[PDB]
Ligand binder design. Structure first.
Ligand code: SF4
Ligand code: SF4
Lengths: 176, 100, 26, 156, 318, 44
């Protein structure tokens, strides 16, 4: 159940004493550490050549939010506001009105990427798979305002990344 | 004159670099950036001095080895070294070597 | 007998001093 | 003009020198410091790019605000920024540093580090993956590459 | 043409320092499973140029406001002495041939501490002053052993003339004769150059930047150049003292190649040590020298005095 | 048919988890004898 680290008594025989005196005087353990570092020097480095080489990611990766569409092209989101409710950082602001066609659509869908925590909620809550955190992670901006996304920005992201997003959802939709 | 030349050249080169590094980059336009306990362990420094004295006394030894009275030379050299060791041992045992 | 004990303790605890004193004596 | 050509080449040289040797300071408040270290870790090692962590603010060129900036920590952050020599660039890592993130409505959290110090590059994420941070750093390098200090001086 | 020789000694040493920086970076990276600087130029050869230019173009901060004369002398003295200490070294023919070049190098090393001593004081800060004091103690503490070990080994040379070391080690390296002294001398070089595990002075993990915390842009670069030049020079002194090289009088190139390779090996050993071990505590550093090393050096000095007499191997004075 | 990420039938191979810091080097007497022999040859 329990193991004693340390709690060992060195031997007092002349051979062991000579060995320990040799270690102290001849710096044996230091040489062992040096040899370890040398071996690591001759080992192949683990660096990947970013940006030309990219780190592995799984289909469930949580990145830039992206509003998706149906195959017909109609926007999937149906103004349920379920995402705004689950949002743990209140980064989602949704406003809706009956559109001219009479469908329930969002007049405003703002995701403040400066307040969002990339929790993965909403993606798992939206009943119609509308907001889906895309695979993109390299969307840094030079100004704070660029990170306050708008419904137009989210829909453009969805249109841009739909080819990858549909494949990732297809990969993972059975696990969900 | 060779050693004097070397000294001059080195000092001038280093000072030239200090000039090109204290004034030349100081031109670049910018703006405003605003902006002891009594060490009793200094005894170690003082002991270094008295040991550096023995260091000086011991430097002639390579030429001292060339004498004909090698017996006397060896006895006196070991005498000085043993006195230095005795001084170190005394300071050690009297906790005088209280480093830091 | 006790001298051997002192030498063993010295070599176990202060080997550098033992080496120095041996070399100086030689 | 020949003078414009010489000025442009000199500005290219100084911008290349500054972007190639970017020395961020060892400044990590919260979780995003872990991903910053993972950037320093062998897989995405920043030293290849010339990015070297140097503790001294006086010997540093970029400040990475990796973590939640609390009201108690804010004056110290401003002080360390001010003691940093110029040219100086600030990279905000994490939703907490960008805009407050999870603790935006907290009484003890500064809602974004832009309020305290100017920010050049904002790295989204919570935590931003080390690859995202490396991307932000390279974007900062491109931003330095686009600088036209000597050109503007010659145009005056 | 003597000025030409001075420049030929000076400028290549500075270039070697600049590229030693890159070498250090890459070696430390590879021993940490990383790759050194490689973006800046082919295999990172242009990184030192970028580093230097960035440093020089950087803001020249100076809140010293005390004895600015000293705050400027310290970098000058450091760099000048680092360059000067290279002069007496025989590679294989020295630039200046001194009967007592060894004691000259010891004196120059002792003087070089004043650069750290003044820089930290004229900075007039907290870490700077206390860190400078810790420096004085460190260099001063190991200067003693450095001298004793040097005297002990030269007892076989028969003079303080560096050039005769080549003759003395013509048949065998002096490391075979004095390896315990060699180990202690190597550790001593490490301490004197303020390198890990004795990098207490700068001591970034403990002291933000040490004595150079208030030095930036060019003066910091001069301190860096002086530090690395001292590293290369001390390793060269080790190579000449112990790892002697064959010298054909008609073809000095062979000796020069052998000496350069040995110095490179020792510098790579310095970087290797910096990577492997952690830093000794200030107190432990002094404990290792005055209480542990100083004794053994005294015993070995007695032995190296006695051996030529009892073995009838007193070296010739000339 | 059910298909979850499950261990392979029979489970995985044993996974080493204890210190294997090897025992290396010559005995102290051997190291001292080698050093003294080198010193004697150098002296001769
Ligand atoms: S991932 Fe961001 S936007 Fe989506 S629910 Fe979580 S905090 Fe809100
Ligand atoms: S953004 Fe996320 S990871 Fe970064 S400090 Fe805030 S909570 Fe931590």
């Amino acid at each position: 159940t329990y193991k004693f680290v340390n709690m060992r008594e060195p031997s007092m025989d002349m051979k062991s004493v000579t060995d320990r005196a040799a270690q102290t005087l001849l710096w044996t353990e230091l040489v062992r550490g040096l040899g370890m570092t040398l071996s690591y020097l001759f080992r192949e480095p683990a660096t990947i050549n970013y940006p030309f080489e990219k780190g592995p990611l799984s289909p469930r990766f949580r990145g830039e939010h992206a509003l998706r569409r149906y195959p017909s092209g109609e926007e999937r989101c149906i103004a349920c506001k379920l995402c705004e409710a689950v949002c743990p950082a209140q980064a989602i602001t949704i406003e809706a009105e009956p559109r001219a066609d009479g469908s329930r659509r969002t007049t405003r869908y703002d995701i403040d990427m400066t307040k969002c925590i990339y929790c993965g909620f909403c993606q798992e809550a939206c009943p119609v798979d509308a907001i889906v955190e895309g695979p993109n992670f390299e969307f840094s901006t030079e100004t704070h305002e660029e990170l306050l996304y708008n419904k137009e920005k989210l829909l453009n992201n969805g249109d841009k990344w739909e080819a990858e997003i549909a494949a990732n959802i297809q990969a993972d939709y059975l696990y969900r | 004159m060779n050693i004097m030349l070397t000294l001059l050249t080195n000092v001038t080169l280093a000072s030239l670099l200090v000039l090109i590094a204290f004034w030349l980059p100081q031109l670049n336009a910018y703006s405003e950036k605003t902006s002891p306990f009594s060490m009793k362990f200094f005894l170690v420094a003082i002991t270094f001095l008295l040991f550096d004295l023995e260091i000086a006394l011991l430097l002639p030894l390579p030429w001292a080895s060339q004498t004909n009275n090698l017996k006397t030379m060896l006895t006196m050299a070991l005498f000085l070294l043993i006195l230095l060791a005795a001084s170190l041992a005394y300071e050690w045992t009297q906790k005088g070597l209280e480093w830091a | 007998g006790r001298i051997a004990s002192f030498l063993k303790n010295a070599w176990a605890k202060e080997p550098v001093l033992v080496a120095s004193f041996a070399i100086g004596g030689l | 003009s020949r003078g414009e050509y010489v000025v442009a080449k000199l500005d290219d040289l100084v911008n290349w020198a500054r972007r190639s040797s970017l020395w961020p300071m060892t400044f990590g408040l919260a979780c995003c410091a872990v991903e910053m270290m993972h950037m320093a870790a062998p897989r995405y090692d920043m030293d290849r790019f010339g990015v070297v962590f140097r503790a001294s603010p006086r010997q540093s060129d970029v400040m990475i605000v990796a973590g939640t900036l609390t009201n108690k920590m804010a004056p110290a952050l401003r002080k360390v920024y001010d003691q940093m020599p110029e040219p100086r660039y600030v990279v905000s890592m994490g939703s907490c540093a960008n805009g407050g993130g999870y603790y935006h409505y907290s009484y003890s959290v500064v809602r974004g580090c832009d309020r305290i110090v100017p920010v050049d590059i904002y790295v989204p994420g919570c935590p931003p993956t080390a690859e995202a941070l490396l991307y932000g750093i390279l974007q900062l390098q491109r931003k330095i590459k686009r600088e036209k200090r000597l050109r503007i001086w010659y145009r005056r | 043409m003597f000025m030409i020789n001075i420049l030929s000694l000076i400028i290549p040493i500075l270039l070697a320092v600049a590229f030693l920086t890159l070498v250090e970076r890459k070696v430390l990276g590879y021993m940490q499973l990383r790759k050194g600087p490689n973006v800046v130029g082919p295999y990172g050869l242009l990184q030192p140029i970028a580093d230097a230019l960035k440093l020089f173009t950087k803001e020249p901060l100076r809140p010293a406001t005390s004895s600015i004369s000293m705050f400027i002398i310290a970098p000058i003295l450091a760099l000048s002495l680092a360059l000067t200490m290279w002069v007496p070294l025989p590679m294989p023919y020295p630039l200046i041939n001194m009967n007592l070049g060894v004691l000259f190098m010891l004196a120059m090393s002792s003087l070089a501490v004043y650069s750290i001593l003044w820089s930290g004081w004229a900075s007039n800060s907290k870490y700077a002053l206390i860190g400078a004091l810790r420096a004085v103690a460190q260099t001063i503490s190991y200067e003693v052993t450095l001298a004793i070990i040097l005297l002990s080994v030269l007892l076989m040379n028969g003079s303080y003339t560096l050039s005769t070391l080549i003759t003395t080690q013509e048949h065998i390296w002096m490391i075979f004769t004095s390896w315990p002294l060699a180990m202690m001398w190597f550790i001593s070089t490490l301490a004197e150059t303020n390198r890990a595990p004795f990098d207490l002075t700068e001591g970034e993990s403990e002291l933000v930047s040490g004595f150079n915390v208030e030095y930036a842009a060019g003066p910091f670069a001069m301190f860096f150049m002086a530090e690395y030049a001292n590293i290369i020079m001390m390793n060269a002194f080790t190579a000449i003292l112990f790892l002697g090289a064959s010298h054909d009088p008609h073809t000095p190139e062979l000796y020069t190649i052998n000496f350069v390779l040995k110095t490179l090996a020792l510098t790579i050993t310095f970087l290797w040590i910096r990577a492997s071990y952690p830093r000794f505590r200030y107190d432990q550093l002094m404990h290792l020298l005055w209480k542990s090393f100083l004794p053994l050096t005294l015993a070995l000095c007695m032995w190296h005095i006695s051996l030529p007499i009892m073995t009838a191997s007193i070296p010739p004075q000339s | 048919k059910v298909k979850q990420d499950m261990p392979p039938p029979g489970g995985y191979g044993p996974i080493d988890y204890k210190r294997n810091l090897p025992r290396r080097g010559l005995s102290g007497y051997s190291m001292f004898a080698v050093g003294i022999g080198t010193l004697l040859f150098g002296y001769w």
